[PDB]
Amino acid sequence: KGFVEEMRFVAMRLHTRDQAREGEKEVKQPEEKAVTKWDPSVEGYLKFLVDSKLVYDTLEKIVQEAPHPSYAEFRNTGLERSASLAEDLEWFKEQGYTIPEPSSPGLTYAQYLKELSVKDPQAFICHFYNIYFAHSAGGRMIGKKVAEKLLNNKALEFYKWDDDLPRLLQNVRDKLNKVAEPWSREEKDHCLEETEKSFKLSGEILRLILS
Ligand code: HEM
């Protein structure tokens, strides 16, 4: 039975019920409240977008270099976001905003991903799944609400895909199921146990929006 379903179960229970129907956590950090209650700023959102771009650039470099050969299965999935973020940062530059340097949440996550990618493929796969699949789920609703609050409803490229998203996602889920099928139970469990750290490091990047 498909291992992605196991990763999704763990991810959902780590959401707050404010923010997702299947979430089981209480609101503890900002950002963990329902998005409609957020008070974002453009300054904070730009830090979030720059730090996000650093993480996506890092994930793209890891699957191209493929220090473990299974990572090459995840090249060119259609979910890559670095080009879309570059376009959106240029839109903000054309509007007169300053683009910030990467902040500590993105620098920290990028460094950790590079380390994991070499030493711990099971833990890396947990982050690959949670980072990309978070974005195409709640990330889209964050983008829409932030654009309503601050951008007069501008629809940024970060929230657009060149192909049907349900099919893109399902084909990556089936690739993830295939890379995990030879794993032992212990390797699968090790992957699942990494999910809290992905939520922590991602959450610190999301919190920039509200900073
Ligand atoms: C402000 C924060 C967040 C909100 C509002 C949010 C909201 C949601 C919602 C409403 C869903 C269910 C809809 C769906 O499956 O398409 C979902 C799914 C998901 N979220 Fe989040 N989420 C947040 C943060 C995170 C974080 C930090 C992670 C992990 C780093 C994450 C990982 C996932 C995953 C993996 C799914 C399953 C998506 C799928 O099955 O394709 N989310 N999220």
Side-chain angles (χ1 to χ4, degrees), residues 106-124:
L107 290 165
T108 297
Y109 204 174
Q111 179 182 333
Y112 181 66
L113 291 165
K114 285 179 216 224
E115 164 230 29
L116 290 178
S117 72
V118 171
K119 65 179 192 185
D120 191 342
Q122 285 69 37
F124 175 72

Side-chain angles (χ1 to χ4, degrees), residues 8 11-12 15 18-22 31-32 35 38 109 129-131 133-134 136-139 141-142 169 173 198-199 202-203 206:
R8 190 185 190 277
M12 290 326 296
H15 286 66
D18 283 17
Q19 74 198 165
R21 169 177 44 89
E22 284 169 274
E31 173 268 357
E32 277 175 355
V35 175
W38 287 12
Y109 204 174
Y129 169 72
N130 278 281
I131 293 164
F133 285 73
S136 44
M141 181 279 273
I142 296 163
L169 292 176
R173 294 194 191 87
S198 183
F199 272 71
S202 296
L206 285 158

Side-chain angles (χ1 to χ4, degrees), residues 30 79 121 163 199:
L79 300 181
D163 283 291
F199 272 71

Side-chain angles (χ1 to χ4, degrees), residues 21 46 52-53 56 66 74 79 143 148 152 183 187 202 206:
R21 169 177 44 89
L46 282 165
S52 292
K53 188 178 178 301
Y56 285 114
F74 295 102
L79 300 181
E148 287 185 28
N152 224 28
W183 287 1
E187 281 172 323
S202 296
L206 285 158

Side-chain angles (χ1 to χ4, degrees), residues 53 81-92 94 156-158:
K53 188 178 178 301
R81 299 286 80 188
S82 56
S84 73
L85 284 160
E87 293 170 358
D88 290 336
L89 292 176
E90 166 67 26
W91 180 84
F92 282 100
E94 295 181 23
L156 291 173
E157 291 290 346
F158 187 36

Side-chain angles (χ1 to χ4, degrees), residues 39-45 91 97 144 146-154 209:
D39 183 11
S41 68
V42 175
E43 160 225 81
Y45 195 48
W91 180 84
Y97 294 96
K144 172 191 185 143
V146 167
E148 287 185 28
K149 283 167 190 281
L150 302 176
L151 308 179
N152 224 28
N153 283 306
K154 176 58 195 169
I209 300 173

